[PDB]
Amino acid sequence: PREAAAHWVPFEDKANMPDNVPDVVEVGATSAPLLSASYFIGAKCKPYNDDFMLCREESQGSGAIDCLKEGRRVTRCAVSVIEDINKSCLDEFRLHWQCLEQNNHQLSGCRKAEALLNKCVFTKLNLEKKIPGLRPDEEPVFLKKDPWIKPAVDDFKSVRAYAEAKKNGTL
Amino acid sequence: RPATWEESEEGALSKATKYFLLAEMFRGLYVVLEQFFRAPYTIYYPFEKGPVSPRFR
Amino acid sequence: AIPFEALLPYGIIFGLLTAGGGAMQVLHVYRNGGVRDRFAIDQWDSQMMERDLRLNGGQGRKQVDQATAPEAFKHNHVWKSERPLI
Amino acid sequence: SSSLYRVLRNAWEVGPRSYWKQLNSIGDTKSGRLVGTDIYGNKFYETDHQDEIHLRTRYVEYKEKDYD
Amino acid sequence: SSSTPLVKTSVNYSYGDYPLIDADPHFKRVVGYMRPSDYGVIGLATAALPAGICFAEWLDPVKGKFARPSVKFLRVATMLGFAVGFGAAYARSSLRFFGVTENAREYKKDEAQMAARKAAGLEPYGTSSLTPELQEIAAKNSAHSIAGLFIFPWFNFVNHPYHGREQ
Amino acid sequence: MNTFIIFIILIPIVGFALLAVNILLAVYKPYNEKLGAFECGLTSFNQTRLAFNAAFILVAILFLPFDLEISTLLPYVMSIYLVSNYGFTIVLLFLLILIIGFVYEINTNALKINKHNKPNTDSLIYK
Amino acid sequence: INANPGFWNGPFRYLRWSAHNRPHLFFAFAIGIAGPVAALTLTPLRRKYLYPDHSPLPQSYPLPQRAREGLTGFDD
Amino acid sequence: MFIGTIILVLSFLGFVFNRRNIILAFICLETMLLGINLILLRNSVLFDDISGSLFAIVIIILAGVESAIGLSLLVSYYRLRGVINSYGI
Amino acid sequence: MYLTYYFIEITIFLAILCTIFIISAKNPMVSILYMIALFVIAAMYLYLIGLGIFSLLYIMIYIGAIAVLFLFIITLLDINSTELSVKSNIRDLPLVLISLIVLTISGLMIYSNDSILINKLLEAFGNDYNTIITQDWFNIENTTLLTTIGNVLLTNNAFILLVLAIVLLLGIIGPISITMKHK
Amino acid sequence: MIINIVEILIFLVCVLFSVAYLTVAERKTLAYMQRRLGPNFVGYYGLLQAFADAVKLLLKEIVLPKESNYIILVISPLITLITALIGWVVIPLGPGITLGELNLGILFSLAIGSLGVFGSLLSGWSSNSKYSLLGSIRSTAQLISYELILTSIFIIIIMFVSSLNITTIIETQRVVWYCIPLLPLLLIFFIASVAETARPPFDLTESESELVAGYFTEYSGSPFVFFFLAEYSNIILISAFNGYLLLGGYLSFNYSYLFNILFNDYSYVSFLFEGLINSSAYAIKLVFLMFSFIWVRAAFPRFTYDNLINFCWIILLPLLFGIFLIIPSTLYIFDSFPTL
């Protein structure tokens, strides 16, 4: 909660989780893949994440040890989402998060690869990207045409792929 | 007799636009900006000498 | 008309700041490894960059994408030990 | 005048070697017509050109590096 | 959503004999419910400050001889008198919301107005342009600030959801 | 080792080096008539203490309570979104409480120095 | 020479006198008074006509108020 | 807590045993205020709250206005007597 | 790597050293310049602890307004001063030493709550255990420290900001009202 | 380790040159305003004039008069030098190209410009004369009095960003500059910038005071080269402050379409070309601004101290209070507060 300052020393511990806790696959995705697939892991794994945080609320200060069984399932279902999005559109997912590698991981600077990825995942993985808390007669911001805030440099691969998807008629 | 403030042809808005937008200051600024774009007078002395009349001493 | 001798030291100042900014951007991109800087870093973003440096293995922002993380990944987790602050 | 076109065209008319010599000599670039030479050896020039201010028309090119 | 108090609140906790109306009434409601005797208190204090200064000169004058005070002082006496009259007015009228003086006249108005907001299908205390945490903090600031009217004027302008009452 | 702290270490070493190349390379050669402060080619006696105007001292005494407000407005400007509609009115009231003390200052003409160059107001009454 | 009439002898004549002869004070106070008077009297007109207010941003993880129904899947 | 307590105690004793002038007494007062700040800011960092930082940012401003007020008091003290004594007021 | 360990202790020693040049300096304004150095040592300690915001608030407010005020006073005013002669302060030295010991120890005493007096002091020195900093992913936005100060000065303690406005007003009115000589 | 020492070497050597040629360019353009050539006897077209001044100026001796503290006399050039030079970190020559990127760069830029007053005031007491001390008083009072409205203009601009980071301001600025809504703010920030360096529209010390050469009259050699460098570093530094918070920092136009014509992929020639465009835009802002300083020097007489204090405290500052009230009220009326 507070930052380490004044000569902090990093240390690691070679040790293992005990016998009674089963093993769990951990997420190997990085900040641009994770920020890319954030909306789709939030769309598929809403009740599991909600179960985890609601358990952690109900057992106060228990915290760590007593809702471990449910933090298993949130990691498992998000790994399921990212495996499925790899096998579905590895190329356009890659186009998206390689765009997000530049521009400070700003989501504002990568709209034209984001449209391709959202179409490809809604077509095949059939998850939709939505923003809740947004009452009607308020346009969602990744749908609007001529935004005020445009990126400095459109990346070249996604402009070319966006024009090719115009020409194919899939868009 | 010098005119009071109320017997003046300028409006308060027209006069104070000249006040806060510094009008004659910008005019005098534009004078020397015009002078930036003209020909200097300097002659190069050991290579070019100035005027001589024969009466000179 | 316009004097080139007046604008020539301004041409120098313009060229020195221009070559300075260009050489600096190339040094920043060579430091990151071919990508741009991160110009404003949150606490969340700083923890996330540390996590990525733990994920990829050694390199700064290699930005790997794998389904399932490796096996040294569960064990290389670090805690930060801060001194007494007297 | 103080334009770049005047120094450019005088650099073209005078030629690059004499340009380098006049640039080490004076700051200006001048094209004259050889009125005459000195008994000490000092070539003098007079300028036809239209864009010349008053007292700019005539000048000396010296001989020595140390000139008076 | 913008109507949950998210707090625990005293319920119908009367401050005197008589039942409370609000725990802090909004400024608009206080200015709405004040009696004609209250506007009389305002007029009394508007008249008492310039008459008080002219009186207090007639007791002992400033320059040895009696003159009237200048209009410069009577103008500021009228202003500060309207200020005293409004402070006394707001304090008197807020006491009737708290249930410490007679409020049988105003309590029927509040039965009627809380029944009219139910028929018109809107919030019981107002839609406000604040997040509910800011409404709670803003009316922890504005709660019971009619005490300490001597030090500082402070009023309620936030439409926050709790006023010490059921439903 | 960021490149922020090379700079703050590195400007001084440049300055110490330029001061050192002056101390090493220029001659020193002083005497008494070279020493002594400059006023226009004439020495004089300096008076031990001199008087000053109250506005001179008042500028920089008065400077600090305006400076402390400008740094008090600095916490608000960073949190301006969070305190929507509410911290706005509090900062209004804060600035207005300041502005009335400022109009006290400008009504008293505290920083203005008068001139005692009066043009002899009083006319010529005779006998 | 220009003398002060005072705000009280004539109101609008004093406003004109301040506008002609003390324009820094008159316009400083005009730009200052244009702020909160408009903040009082122009914002309900905007909420009625131009556009209504935006929905609030979240600040932490939004907890619902429920009682942990059972979930199936990802047991082992 | 060592740096704030040592600044406070050494500044306090330098204030008390000042007999040489008066501006040393003012600056010993200001270094005291710095020491109280240091102790509090550390306690805020160790307790994970802005709370002591709230009292800190208020006492910064109050130390400022104390300087402004009291140095105008000194100019008033100097107005009638064109020199300030070494032994004190 | 462990050259960067003793920094805090260095600043403490450095801060100690600076105060001895404040209370003992022949020229006044040289000692006020040492006080400016002590503000710089404080801002070093505040960056060093983790509060980078405050360090620049100290350099802005204390160094740039309060010290500028002090130097500005010392310039155009008359202040006599005597040097630190041994003969005038050697009489102070024993009460100096007694007060150093007592005020230092008793300042170190109230951080602790054993009833026994000697156990109060030793808990002052038992700090050599290294606090463990854990990463918690619960915060989603860059609320810095200055943002939180601007939220608590403005909602929970708005009245303190407003009474503070009265204090800043007083700091305007007062120096004026002394140094006017109205008419 | 090799890469950060070569970047700070190249930024140092680009800024320390560009403060030398500023003074050459100043004598040039001030000459052509007055219809005469500048220097042309020192380089091929007059260049490296400042190097002739500097190499001679390092060879003059240092005299330390008898009334002076000799330490203070030589340490005020060092502290004025470093304070005018430490502020060159935080400027960006492009997105996140600084010499230290910190989250609060305005608070640093505003605390270093507070440290520059001392080398005026402190330099008044070295060689204590009653005709010198009071001139240092007048200079320091002017210097702080216009630093007030400088700091205030900053806080009015940070009302729109609500972030003390600087490249965050310039990225915010891509939708519109801040000069074009806030046009009177450009004029009063320019004149407060002219005041804060004590330029000779707003000077009294160098010319009019009882010293013939300002507060630094009695100097020679290194204490004069450090003050001379510090004034023109202050010129281009407050020019940089204007360049990022009021004009566009590195922003000229969109230039996405020109790239989608020219390039194919991210490569080092593309980052080089983008860096040249960004720092070219920043440099042409900063060069038009130093030309504005030299242009206002040419045309005008100077100020009495009474005119100066009556200017700052009685005219500009009440107008500034009106600006404090009007701009958050405009952000209030429409539903637009800036988010962190």
Ligand SMILES: CCCCCCCCCCCCCCCCCC(=O)OC[C@H](COP(=O)(O)OCCN)OC(=O)CCCCCCCCCCCCCCCCC
């Ligand atoms: C309806 C909405 C409201 C409308 C109003 C809008 C308000 C916002 C406008 C704000 C703009 C303010 C600009 C600064 C204004 C300064 C006012 C001024 O000119 O100074 C007046 C002062 C004389 O004062 P005074 O006593 O009143 O004179 C009466 C004579 N009996 O005389 C002086 O002090 C001397 C003048 C000094 C001016 C400084 C000049 C220095 C540099 C000039 C910068 C030029 C910029 C050029 C840059 C490049 C341009 C391409």
